[PDB]
Design a protein around this nucleic acid. Structure first.
Lengths: 141, 49, 137, 191, 75, 61, 141
RNA sequence: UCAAAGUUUAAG
RNA sequence: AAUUCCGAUAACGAACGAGACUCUGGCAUGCUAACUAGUUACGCGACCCCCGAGCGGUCGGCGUCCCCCAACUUCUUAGAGGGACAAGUGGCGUUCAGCCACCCGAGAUUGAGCAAUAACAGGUCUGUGAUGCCCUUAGAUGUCCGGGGCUGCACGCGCGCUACACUGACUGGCUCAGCGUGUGCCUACCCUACGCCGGCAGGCGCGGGUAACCCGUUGAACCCCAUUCGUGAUGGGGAUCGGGGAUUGCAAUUAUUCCCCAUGAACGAGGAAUUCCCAGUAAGUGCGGGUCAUAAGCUUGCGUUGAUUAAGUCCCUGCCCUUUGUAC
């Protein structure tokens, strides 16, 4: 069983837990202080969010390769309340995406590809698709 | 038919309420007893059907 | 759980213990949902708690962080007064102190007889918005 | 599932319509009661095409209302399902039957058509069409449920359930059933 | 007319009322608990989660906006 | 007495603004009976009205 | 020789192509089974044909579907049309016509949408208003 | 099978 | 739908308009087509690591590495054809013109473009090296440079945006578009992938792109799924205002824009009034194009989600014909 056979929501939860248990990611200094994108009124309520979005980046990379930082900002984009003016798009934070991608690089989940942009690697394909199998074998539900 | 149903007398032919009315022009025209006519059709003093 | 305060008195303000802590603090002039959350993370508090819970030590600990942000790594940006003319400091002004700092700046512009102070003095819009159509008070 | 079609969970059969008039224009079953109350459904094409649209779909559509909820069907599909769940727990019996009953005692019987009458407006009573009775019922009770659910802690679904229950029961307690008897009373007052 | 003031606490009498009464209802939602009592809403949700964990009330559905709970599952 | 009545012939659309269909009705219980009446809403040949009154019979309006 | 059939469904701008093949009846959209896709409230939709006709009719025909264009709902209505249409086209060609006819009848009495595609498509805006038919507000006084 | 509805630059 | 027809007949036979027409929308497993579409399913020739299922075979899944001496056009682009006519069946209609229904299937109706006569003393001389006359013409009403102003606020009106929340807000997560546009220019500069530095706006490197080639499977929003919050002017709302930081520019103070922290107003659905709209429409929802160094609360396009109610009538407001009255 691959990762596409699993309900992607409960996948990223399991991948995040995996990345915590490993405990060799490289969460930078800011995490606590940072906003996460110019969209946001607030920072994340889940205090160990870095692990979660790292997981989310990895799974995105499995599904679609060649994803640069700009591509990672575009995917983590949304609405921007101008408040009294109407809403627009805004690309997500670059640096956090870049730190996530550099963290995965150190893990050896991923590798910077030819023709630019990240792709995940075999050793990364391991973990992603291993935990998919774990989720599939959780229970018939 | 409701009255025929609840009549005492068998069959019974009903009555009729007769009135000769007298409209003056104003009141005739307003109540559409008489419309106007074109200058040539004014002269057709046959009644309508 | 926790049957203690419920209502709080901190830095001249009456914080609703009834409220949840990150949003309870913000009652104070000078701290917004950003800064309160930051302050709570540096305190290392389970912020799911209500403000009516919490030990008196914990609330004092929070106050000390809030007052002196840069000693517990609350960075430069998260500071409502950066590079503030009266000394070249960078810090976060709170409570009546904030309102006093504001009044000093308006008073400074007034004393200078700058444009922006004059409009402030005249009770007009300062940030060059059109005044033909709006703010009829 | 292959022989008989459930509504996710609920049954189509054993849903008896009382009033021979609401019948025909309530499509809880011809035989045709589908899985979902969402549908592609171009039922606005011709005049009476509307009548053969299912009543649970029609209820969903009516729910999808008051600016901010315009077009948000799935939003309201979920609402409907939750209201049906809540009806099942609270009342028992099929929530589709409860809904049908509500519809039957919530549509008017006669209304007062605004005729001119010289100049100043005084109406005459007239006797409403079954489709029109079904339409009104639907929107009345949907609206009553909506109006209930604004500024207090109560989900739309829950309100929607409470309205349908108090319509099915001749409660004089739902918005819709009370509104209907007020129209009827006005009608009688100029019949 | 409306001015509704709620509780946010483990304040004894209400907690006993939750343990006795709430498991006998048919509809058990945070909203319905809040209208029965004078309990906040978040407090109501937590209380209903505790009763789930204890095994005194039954899960119907656990959806984003609305959760639904039932009587014990009697016999 | 709430009498039901099946429509035999939808006659023509009256009402000031155009609204009340003038409808000819068979009286359901005893089909010898046949009145006319006005109706708010969309009507068609072969449906059933619920008449609360059963003795009024409208004409022009 | 293999039994291949590539049939499309449409809805506004959603070209869902379902591709039937002599297999064991998996039925997966893009790269995943019918229990995600993930508007999810509209799961019974993309299930409908299978639920109507049963697993017995599908049984020996594996169907890989690919979708693009449209939005979430339109895509579901496309795939639902397509997989049913594909099944009918398989039965036409590599089974027998009386069997097809029976399937077609069973689908249509449920809904004509399953085979016939809606012509309805987004109407063009004209100047003097924010949309097609609505106009900008008139001032008068 | 009839409620109320008056007036219109000197400035071409 | 139509001065559209049929039919009547001191008229006859014509012209315009309407219709036809042009573009568009939707049907074609039919035909012609492809490395600037897909590839399409094969072949899996594979790479590839346990990638997974699985003892191992065989399968599931993509990323792609793929050319060409694989196979084609289902999806794609766009050609020229076809395709619906009121043609069929039943009524209704002078058994004409036609109307209604139903079959087959798009059911005459997808939506635009074009658009007569005669007008108006409508607007436009501030679009023109279209232009009469009048004015002015070196201390210029010419022209250029500096500065200011068109943005000034007791107030009144018009089109707009944002809201007043929990059918919600926030924080995560998941996941689908379509018209377009783009440098190497008519006077100085575009779209921008990828890599680092920066919380953020942004900065610095290298690349691709006169474009179905690169941006770009344009990974849009709403939506969907888990968050907390709990009817409190509340975490709804985001005005006003203080401090800082970016870019555009020759120059931004009267805040050019953008980012950040802080501040946190009225507003709890709007009186009399009155606008717009009938099908993928209204409404929500974003994204293009225009202007544009800097750049949309406007506009003009685009899709995405998708209702209620009508299928009628002359009551109001108007319009078209006929008769009529008229001191206009």
């Amino acid at each position: 069983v691959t990762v596409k056979d699993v309900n992607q929501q409960e996948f990223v939860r399991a991948l995040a837990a995996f990345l915590k248990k490993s405990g060799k990611l490289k969460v930078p200094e800011w995490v606590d202080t940072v906003k996460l994108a110019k969209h946001k009124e607030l920072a994340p309520y889940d205090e160990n969010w870095f692990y979660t979005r790292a997981a989310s980046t990895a799974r995105h990379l499995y599904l679609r390769g060649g994803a640069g930082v700009g591509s990672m900002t575009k995917i983590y984009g949304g609405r921007q309340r101008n408040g009294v003016m109407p809403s627009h798009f805004s690309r997500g934070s670059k640096s956090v995406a870049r730190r996530v991608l550099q963290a995965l690089e150190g893990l050896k989940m991923v590798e910077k590809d030819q023709d630019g942009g990240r792709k995940l690697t075999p050793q990364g394909q391991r973990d992603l698709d291993r935990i998919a199998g774990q989720v599939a074998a959780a229970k018939k539900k | 038919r409701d009255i025929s149903e609840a009549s005492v007398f068998d069959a019974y032919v009903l009555p009729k309420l007769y009135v000769k009315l007298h409209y003056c022009v104003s009141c005739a025209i307003h109540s559409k007893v008489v419309r106007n006519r074109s200058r040539e059709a004014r002269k057709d003093r046959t009644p309508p059907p | 759980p926790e049957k203690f305060q419920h209502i709080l008195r901190v830095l001249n303000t009456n914080i609703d213990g009834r409220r949840k802590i990150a949003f309870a603090i913000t009652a104070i002039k000078g701290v917004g949902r950003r800064y309160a959350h930051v302050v709570l993370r540096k305190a290392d508090i389970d912020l799911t708690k209500r403000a009516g819970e919490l030990t008196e030590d914990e609330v004092e600990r929070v106050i000390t962080i809030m007052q002196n942000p840069r000693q517990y790594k609350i960075p430069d940006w998260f500071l409502n007064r950066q590079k503030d003319v009266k000394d070249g400091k960078y810090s976060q002004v709170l409570a009546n102190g904030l309102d006093n700092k504001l009044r000093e700046d308006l008073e400074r512009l007034k004393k200078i007889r700058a444009h922006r102070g004059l409009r402030h003095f005249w009770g007009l819009r300062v940030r060059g918005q059109h005044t033909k159509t709006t703010g009829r008070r | 599932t292959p022989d008989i079609k459930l509504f996710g969970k609920w049954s189509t059969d054993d849903v008896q319509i009382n009033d021979i008039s609401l019948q025909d224009y309530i499509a809880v079953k011809e035989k045709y009661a589908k899985y979902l109350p969402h549908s592609a459904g171009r039922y606005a094409a011709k005049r009476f095409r509307k009548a053969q649209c299912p009543i649970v779909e029609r209820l969903t559509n009516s729910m999808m209302m008051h600016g901010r909820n315009n077009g948000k069907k799935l939003m309201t599909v979920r609402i409907v399902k939750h209201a049906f769940e809540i009806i099942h727990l609270l009342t028992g019996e099929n929530p589709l039957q409860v809904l049908v009953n509500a519809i039957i005692n919530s549509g008017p019987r006669e209304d007062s058509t605004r005729i001119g009458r010289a100049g100043t407006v005084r109406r005459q009573a007239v006797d409403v069409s079954p489709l029109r009775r079904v339409n009104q019922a639907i929107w009345l009770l949907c609206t009553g449920a909506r109006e209930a659910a604004f500024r207090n802690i109560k989900t739309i679904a829950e309100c929607l359930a409470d309205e349908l229950i108090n319509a099915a029961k001749g409660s004089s307690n739902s918005y819709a059933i009370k509104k209907k008897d007020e129209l009827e009373r006005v009608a009688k007052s100029n019949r | 007319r409306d001015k509704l003031n709620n509780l946010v606490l483990f304040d004894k009498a209400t907690y006993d009322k939750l343990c006795k009464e709430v498991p006998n209802y048919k509809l058990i939602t945070p909203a319905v608990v809040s209208e029965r009592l004078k309990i906040r809403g978040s407090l109501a949700r937590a209380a209903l989660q505790e009763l789930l964990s204890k095994g005194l009330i039954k899960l119907v559905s656990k959806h984003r906006a609305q959760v639904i709970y039932t009587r014990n599952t009697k016999g | 007495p709430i009498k039901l009545a099946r429509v035999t012939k939808v006659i023509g659309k009256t009402g000031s603004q155009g609204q009340c269909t003038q409808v000819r009705v068979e009286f359901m219980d005893d089909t010898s009976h046949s009145t006319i009446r006005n109706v708010k809403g969309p009507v068609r040949e072969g449906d059933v009205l619920t008449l609360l009154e059963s003795e009024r019979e409208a004409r022009r309006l | 020789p293999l039994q291949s059939v590539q049939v499309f469904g449409r809805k506004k701008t959603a070209t869902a192509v379902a591709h039937c093949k002599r297999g064991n009846g998996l039925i997966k959209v893009n790269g995943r089974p019918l229990e995600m896709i993930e508007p999810r409230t509209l799961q019974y939709k993309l299930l409908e044909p299978v639920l109507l006709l049963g697993k017995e009719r599908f049984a020996g025909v594996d169907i890989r579907v690919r979708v693009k264009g449209g939005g979430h709902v339109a895509q579901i209505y496309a795939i639902r049309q397509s997989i049913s249409k594909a099944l009918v086209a398989y039965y036409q060609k590599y089974v027998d016509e009386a069997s097809k006819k029976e399937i077609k009848d069973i689908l249509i009495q449920y809904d004509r949408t399953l085979l016939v595609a809606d012509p309805r498509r987004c109407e063009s805006k004209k100047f003097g208003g924010p949309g097609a038919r609505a106009r900008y507000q008139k001032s008068y006084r």
